[PDB]
């Protein structure tokens, strides 16, 4: 019976909840009576994406009501959704194509997880957990409380929680030390850049079985290039909070899972507004999206060289800027390194 830790043991049963996983098909309105998680599949998930992007064109470029229509009607024959009372809403409008897109990420992320729970489990020796477990790839080690280390994070989260982000306060419950396999290796070049820093991602839990597996990933070339303010990459914050509400937490549901990673930004193209970035600038290693609010500079310290940012929210200054708080792209995975992994309590 496993040799785990009880933390890191739970921390397993959380990402491999199947619970987690079908209430989060429900709350994507998808009908999983015609659809169950079982049924879920890669190659299905894909021609969605492209019936999306193809939608995203026409209403974009005025195609016909009935070309709309028809991408609508194969959206929903493909992924059965149940409106309940209501209409189906028509893929008319763009907001409502990006939360489709969206769900689209999070079911590519289930499935992940779904599958790698059903297979490979050969083993009646050792412990499912510590099957489960092996199959995330990824050294996880509890943080000691009291040690320097977590009382830095804990900082970071107690100082950089945002002032229009009050529905609610942060409790940290856990911190683990994460080391994905192969990762170290594929981020070394990038340790040959300066500003190198300690940066906030937040997602649902049910992501977390594809993200320790397959590392944060970039929106493939075939998703609609639609509502990404500056770009497909990996996005992350200075500020706890604005990455905190990207956990998806409620009152009826408030334990989420947060990363920290280390992300090499080197020489940052410094910006204000949307703007749909496809290549970088000679020397650019990076964008920042400035922000009318961040973390005051002189707080800021250094965790293994890395720079922690983990000052009380002061005002920015740059106020011409569409943001109100900052937030850090990067447009080659091989740009990050997770370090951390802290399951938070949010209190509503
Ligand atoms: C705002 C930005 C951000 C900033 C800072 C931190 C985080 C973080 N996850 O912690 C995030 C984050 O996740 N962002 C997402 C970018 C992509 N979109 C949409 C995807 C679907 C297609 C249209 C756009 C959702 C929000």
Same mark, same amino acid.
């Given at each position: 019976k496993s040799k785990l830790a009880k933390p890191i043991q739970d921390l397993i049963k959380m990402i491999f909840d199947v619970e987690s996983m079908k209430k989060a098909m429900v709350e994507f309105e998808i009908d999983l009576q015609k659809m169950?998680?079982?049924?879920?599949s890669k190659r299905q998930i894909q021609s969605a994406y492209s019936i999306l992007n193809e939608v995203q064109q026409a209403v974009s470029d005025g195609g016909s009501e009935s070309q709309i229509l028809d991408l609508s009607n194969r959206f929903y024959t493909l992924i059965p959704h149940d409106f309940g009372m209501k209409k189906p809403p028509l893929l008319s409008n763009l907001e409502y194509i990006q939360a489709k897109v969206q769900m689209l990420d999070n079911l590519l992320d289930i499935e992940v997880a779904y599958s790698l729970l059903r297979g490979?489990?050969?083993?009646?020796?050792?412990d499912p957990i510590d099957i489960n477990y092996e199959k995330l790839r990824t050294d996880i080690k509890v943080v000691d409380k009291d040690s320097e280390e977590a009382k830095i994070i804990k900082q970071y989260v107690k100082n950089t929680? !945002? !002032?229009?982000?009050?529905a609610y306060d942060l409790k940290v419950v856990e911190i683990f030390r994460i080391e994905r396999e192969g990762e170290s290796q594929r981020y070394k070049?990038?340790?040959?850049?300066?500003n190198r820093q300690l940066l906030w991602h937040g997602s649902r839990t049910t992501n977390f079985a594809g993200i320790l597996s397959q590392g944060l990933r970039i929106a493939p070339?075939? #998703?609609?290039? @639609?509502?990404?303010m500056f770009g497909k990459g990996i996005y992350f914050a200075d500020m706890v909070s604005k990455s905190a509400?990207?956990?998806? @937490?409620?009152? #009826?549901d408030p334990i989420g899972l947060i990363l920290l990673g280390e992300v090499a930004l080197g020489n940052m193209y410094e910006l204000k507004n949307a703007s749909h970035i496809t290549k970088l600038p000679k020397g650019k290693h990076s964008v920042k999206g400035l922000g009318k609010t961040a973390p005051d500079p002189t707080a800021t310290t250094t965790l293994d060289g890395v720079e922690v940012p983990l000052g009380n929210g002061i005002s920015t200054?740059?106020?011409? @800027?569409?943001?109100l708080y900052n937030e850090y792209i990067v447009?080659?995975? #091989?740009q990050v390194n997770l370090k951390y992994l802290l399951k938070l309590k949010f209190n509503y």
């Open positions: 169950p998680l079982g049924k879920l490979g489990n050969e083993d009646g020796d050792k929680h !945002a !002032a229009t982000h009050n070049p990038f340790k040959q850049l300066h070339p075939e #998703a609609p290039v @639609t509502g990404y509400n990207y956990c998806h @937490t409620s009152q #009826a200054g740059i106020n011409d @800027t569409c943001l447009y080659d995975v #091989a």
